[PDB]
Structure formats: C-alpha cells, structure tokens
C-alpha cells in the first residue's frame, strides 16, 4: 500500500539489561526506517513489512518495563506532516539526485 507510519519507543535502561535492549531495538528499527528525532522514527511500509517489523520488535522489548507506540497516517501523508525546526529529513518521493 506504500503508507507512512511512525514508531516511538521508550526502553528503561536502568534494568538489568536495558542498554543491550536499547541497542538491539534501535538497530532493528533503523533497518526498516529513517530516523527523524531521538527515539522517533518514520518510514514508508506496506502491510507485510509493518507486520514483519511488529513481530520482530515485539520480541526484543520486555513488557512491564518498556513502551512502544506505532501510528499510521495513510496514503495522503504529504498533508498531515509539518516540520518547523532545523532537523530536515530526506523525502522518499524525491528523485534522490545525490
């Protein structure tokens, strides 16, 4: 469907293995998406990639210790997105002339 989704995490690093969980979660979530803010990623995925990422990521985090939220906008994401500061991000609809 090629729809834009956004993922936020919040892992407790004061536990026994918080640092390793943070590292694995960040590494796994960076593969499927592009970082826009600290602990806030956005990506363009279908239903299949979204389901695969959700299944992969629900096994790395530990319940009753972490938080993870996933939002989806839709095919019209170009309207419901606003940037005001000085942290630009690459748009995956650009011809990408590097």
Q: Based on the number of CB atoms within 10 Å of its own CB, is 66 exposed (0-12), middle (13-18) or buried (19 or more)?
A: middle
Nearest by Cα to 66 from 20, 21, 27, 10: 10
The option from DNA, another protein, a copy of itself, none interacting with 71 (CB < 5 to 8 A, set by class) reads a copy of itself
46 annotated as a binding-site residue = no
The option from another protein, DNA, a copy of itself, none interacting with 24 (CB < 5 to 8 A, set by class) reads DNA
Nearer to DNA, 25 or 45 (CB): 25
Residues annotated within a binding site for Mg(2+): 10
């Amino acid at each position: 469907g090629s729809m834009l989704v956004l993922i936020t995490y919040d892992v407790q690093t004061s536990s026994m293995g918080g640092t390793k969980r943070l590292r694995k979660v960040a590494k796994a979530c960076q593969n499927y998406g592009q970082r826009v803010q600290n602990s806030v990623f956005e990506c363009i995925v279908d239903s299949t990639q979204l389901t695969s990422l959700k299944l992969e990521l629900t096994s790395l985090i530990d319940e009753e210790k972490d938080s993870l939220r996933i939002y989806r906008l839709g095919n019209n994401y170009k309207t419901k997105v606003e940037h005001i500061g000085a942290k630009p991000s690459i748009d995956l609809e650009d011809p990408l002339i590097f």
